[PDB]
Amino acid sequence: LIANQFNSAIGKIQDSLSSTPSALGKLQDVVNQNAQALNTLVKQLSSNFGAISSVLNDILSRLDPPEAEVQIDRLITGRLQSLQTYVTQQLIRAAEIRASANLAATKMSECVLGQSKRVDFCGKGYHLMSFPQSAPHGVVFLHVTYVPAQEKNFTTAPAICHDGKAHFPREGVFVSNGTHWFVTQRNFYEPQIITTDNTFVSGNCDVVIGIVNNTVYDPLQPELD
Amino acid sequence: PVSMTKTSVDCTMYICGDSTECSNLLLQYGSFCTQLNRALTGIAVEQDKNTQEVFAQVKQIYKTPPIKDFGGFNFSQILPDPSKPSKRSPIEDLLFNKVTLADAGFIKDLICAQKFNGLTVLPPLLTDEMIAQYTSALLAGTITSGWTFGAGPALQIPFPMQMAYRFNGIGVTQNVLYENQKLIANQFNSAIGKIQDSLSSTPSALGKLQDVVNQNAQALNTLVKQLSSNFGAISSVLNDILSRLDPPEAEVQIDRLITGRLQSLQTYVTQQLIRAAEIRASANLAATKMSECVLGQSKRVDFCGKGYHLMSFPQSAPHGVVFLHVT
Amino acid sequence: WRVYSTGSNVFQTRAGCLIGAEHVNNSYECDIPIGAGICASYQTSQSIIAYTMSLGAENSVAYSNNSIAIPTNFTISVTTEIL
Numbered sequence: 001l002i003a004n005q006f007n008s009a010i011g012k013i014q015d016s017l018s019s020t021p022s023a024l025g026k027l028q029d030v031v032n033q034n035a036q037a038l039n040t041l042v043k044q045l046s047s048n049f050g051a052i053s054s055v056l057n058d059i060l061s062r063l064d065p066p067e068a069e070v071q072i073d074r075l076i077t078g079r080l081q082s083l084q085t086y087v088t089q090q091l092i093r094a095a096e097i098r099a100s101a102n103l104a105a106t107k108m109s110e111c112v113l114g115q116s117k118r119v120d121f122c123g124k125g126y127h128l129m130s131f132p133q134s135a136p137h138g139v140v141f142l143h144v145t146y147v148p149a150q151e152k153n154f155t156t157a158p159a160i161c162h163d164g165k166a167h168f169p170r171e172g173v174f175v176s177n178g179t180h181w182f183v184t185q186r187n188f189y190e191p192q193i194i195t196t197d198n199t200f201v202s203g204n205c206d207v208v209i210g211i212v213n214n215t216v217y218d219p220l221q222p223e224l225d
Numbered sequence: 226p227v228s229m230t231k232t233s234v235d236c237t238m239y240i241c242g243d244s245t246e247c248s249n250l251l252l253q254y255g256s257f258c259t260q261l262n263r264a265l266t267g268i269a270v271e272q273d274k275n276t277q278e279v280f281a282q283v284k285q286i287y288k289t290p291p292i293k294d295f296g297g298f299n300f301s302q303i304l305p306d307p308s309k310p311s312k313r314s315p316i317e318d319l320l321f322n323k324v325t326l327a328d329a330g331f332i333k334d335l336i337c338a339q340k341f342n343g344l345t346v347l348p349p350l351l352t353d354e355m356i357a358q359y360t361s362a363l364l365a366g367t368i369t370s371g372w373t374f375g376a377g378p379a380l381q382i383p384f385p386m387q388m389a390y391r392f393n394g395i396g397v398t399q400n401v402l403y404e405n406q407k408l409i410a411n412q413f414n415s416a417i418g419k420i421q422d423s424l425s426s427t428p429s430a431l432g433k434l435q436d437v438v439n440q441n442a443q444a445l446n447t448l449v450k451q452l453s454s455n456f457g458a459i460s461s462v463l464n465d466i467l468s469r470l471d472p473p474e475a476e477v478q479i480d481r482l483i484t485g486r487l488q489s490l491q492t493y494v495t496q497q498l499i500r501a502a503e504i505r506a507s508a509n510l511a512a513t514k515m516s517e518c519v520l521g522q523s524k525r526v527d528f529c530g531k532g533y534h535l536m537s538f539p540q541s542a543p544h545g546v547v548f549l550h551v552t
Numbered sequence: 553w554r555v556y557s558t559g560s561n562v563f564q565t566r567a568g569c570l571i572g573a574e575h576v577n578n579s580y581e582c583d584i585p586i587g588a589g590i591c592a593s594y595q596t597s598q599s600i601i602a603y604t605m606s607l608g609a610e611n612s613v614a615y616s617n618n619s620i621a622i623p624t625n626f627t628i629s630v631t632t633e634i635l
């Protein structure tokens with residue numbers, strides 16, 4: 001069953017990436033912004049900045065030096081300001097990408113090389129494993145997780161009074177079909193008879209509120225009698 | 226902190242305020258103003274992305290049942306109160322009244338003096354009435370289902386049995402809780418009440434939020450003051466230079482004023498970009514704490530309060546979030 | 553331009569004045585963000601509608617002081633994450 005569900009889920013990942021075109025926008029936007037910045041920088045070469053022309057050789061081929069100096073200084077001031085703007089914005093974007101790369105390194109170390117217990121760090125549900133794949137300028141994780149879904153209701157009680165002693169579950173919880181009482185682990189329904197080997201005794205049964213009266217089967221008494 | 230104030234600046238009303246000649250001089254500088262509007266619009270989008278990342282963790286709106294037999298625990302100081310026009314908890318009321326918020330920015334002072342020079346404040350996408358609804362959904366899911374609502378379908382469980390599970394997490398055997406339920410109930414209620422009174426008394430508690438607001442206002446303030454500087458021209462008023470001098474000599478003065486005002490805008494935009502990076506780092510930390518302290522139980526030491534962590538409750542605050550860690 | 557300002561479907565939001573979009577009484581998930589809890593989308597004979605965005609489906613958990621819900625079956629789910 002788990003083999004079939006796993007293979008089917010990988011196939012749905014295949015088809016969902018093969019059909020939806022806006023999936024990889026987190027990568028794509030990065031590329032777009034970089035190209036956009038360079039584009040603006042190139043068309044800052046066409047601005048006059050107050051000079052006679054935006055072409056430097058037309059200032060050179062027309063004017064004598066004592067005023068060609070004056071126009072060229074204005075052009076230099078404008079173009080240098082454009083470079084400083086571009087470099088500052090590139091520094092800030094590089095800081096953002098470095099933060100994203102540190103997060104990717106943390107996910108690679110913890111989701112892939114081990115099993116994580118942080119909630120919603122390695123996908124939705126209880127985490128089982130992860131597989132990395134490369135992407136152009138980025139990484140793609142496939143998180144394989146466990147999601148429990150078909151629930152029923154039962155009626156519980158925190159303890160069982162048997163012989164003036166309160167019995168508590170070693171691991172799990174006490175549930176009821178409606179008539180009997182069983183011990184069940186907390187994430188999958190499989191009822192078991194309440195024995196001495198999966199409960200522990202603690203005190204008498206006059207302190208705990210909501211304790212229900214039942215019997216606990218001892219595995220030794222039918223062996224002797 | 227989670228988000229800051231979305232602000233938009235129009236160049237042409239700031240630099241060449243209501244002038245055609247100054248606009249024609251400004252067109253020779255290329256595309257600075259398209260760049261500035263792109264940067265500020267990017268920040269304004271990222272603020273809403275921060276708030277949506279932090280609070281919108283679940284996609285169903287749970288509701289607490291009207292009966293309140295939680296085994297002795299009393300959540301009345303964090304649950305929403307139906308007897309108020311905005312359905313908020315009283316701790317959220319104190320948090321709203323502590324912060325002296327400025328620059329409200331709804332449709333209609335010093336805010337008007339800022340407004341008349343091309344400075345605008347955009348409203349956030351999520352109002353304060355829907356952030357309270359996410360907060361109420363998170364508390365209802367936590368107190369009626371445990372941690373399972375953040376990992377699948379919500380499964381109900383009695384509250385002292387959930388709290389026994391949480392002692393079983395930190396290495397204390399669960400018979401400790403069931404034999405001391407009244408004591409734990411009294412300690413928990415008294416601790417919540419002391420949180421109420423301590424926040425009601427100390428005035429400097431919320432400085433982490435307040436400083437953020439202050440810094441933003443300060444930046445806007447000095448930007449407005451940079452309109453009053455001469456920069457070497459004969460006046461700081463553009464209409465006087467226009468009303469006195471002929472164009473071939475007034476162009477030289479107006480160019481100097483344009484250079485100074487454009488440098489002021491670039492300084493303001495650079496510092497806003499750096500502050501937005503700081504706030505985004507804080508919002509990512511808040512999202513991590515919401516996913517790991519609230520929706521589950523953490524085992525990282527001192528990540529979710531000092532001591533052995535049991536559970537946590539979120540509350541909203543103006544431009545921020547407040548966690549109560551029960552430990 | 554004045555060929556839109558005729559309107560007859562003007563709307564007043566806390567973000568400003570919206571012209572050219574009809575207001576509905578439903579609540580959907582957000583498509584294009586406008587502000588103050590108002591989003592807008594393109595739907596039905598097709599038009600542009602503006603609505604109050606909906607946070608999500610309402611759910612009520614049947615809490616009780618002696619009742620638990622336990623799963624019986626499970627699902628293996630594979631999700632992606634791009635960085």
Ligand SMILES: *[C@@H]1O[C@H](CO)[C@@H](O[C@@H]2O[C@H](CO)[C@@H](O)[C@H](O)[C@H]2NC(C)=O)[C@H](O)[C@H]1NC(C)=O
Binds near residue numbers: 177178
């Ligand atoms: C309570 O659980 C018991 C589990 O044994 C169920 O009782 C069994 O019922 C079948 C008939 O459906 C009998 O053949 C078995 O002998 C019963 N078991 C015992 C130990 O007597 C019972 O159905 C459950 N209660 C309800 C209300 O479903």
Ligand SMILES: *[C@@H]1O[C@H](CO)[C@@H](O[C@@H]2O[C@H](CO)[C@@H](O)[C@H](O)[C@H]2NC(C)=O)[C@H](O)[C@H]1NC(C)=O
Binds near residue numbers: 299300
């Ligand atoms: C939960 O705690 C609140 C604390 O505010 C209790 O409300 C107070 O109850 C006393 C008892 O009569 C009143 O004198 C106070 O005026 C109440 N204060 C408020 C603000 O309502 C509340 O009773 C507790 N819950 C339960 C179920 O007892």
Ligand SMILES: *[C@@H]1O[C@H](CO)[C@@H](O[C@@H]2O[C@H](CO)[C@@H](O)[C@H](O)[C@H]2NC(C)=O)[C@H](O)[C@H]1NC(C)=O
Binds near residue numbers: 001004005624625627
């Ligand atoms: C648990 O769930 C799985 C599916 O999640 C069930 O498997 C299906 O069972 C039906 C039988 O009615 C088959 O027709 C399907 O082909 C099965 N699906 C797969 C993927 O194998 C399974 O029966 C459930 N088990 C219980 C005890 O409820």
Ligand SMILES: *[C@@H]1O[C@H](CO)[C@@H](O)[C@H](O)[C@H]1NC(C)=O
Binds near residue numbers: 153614
């Ligand atoms: C839970 O199960 C009980 C049966 O013990 C039933 O009466 C109740 O209606 C169920 N509640 C829900 C929400 O399914």
Ligand SMILES: *[C@@H]1O[C@H](CO)[C@@H](O)[C@H](O)[C@H]1NC(C)=O
Binds near residue numbers: 211294
């Ligand atoms: C649950 O509440 C009911 C109130 O109708 C009460 O009779 C019952 O004893 C309570 N059960 C527990 C375990 O506290």
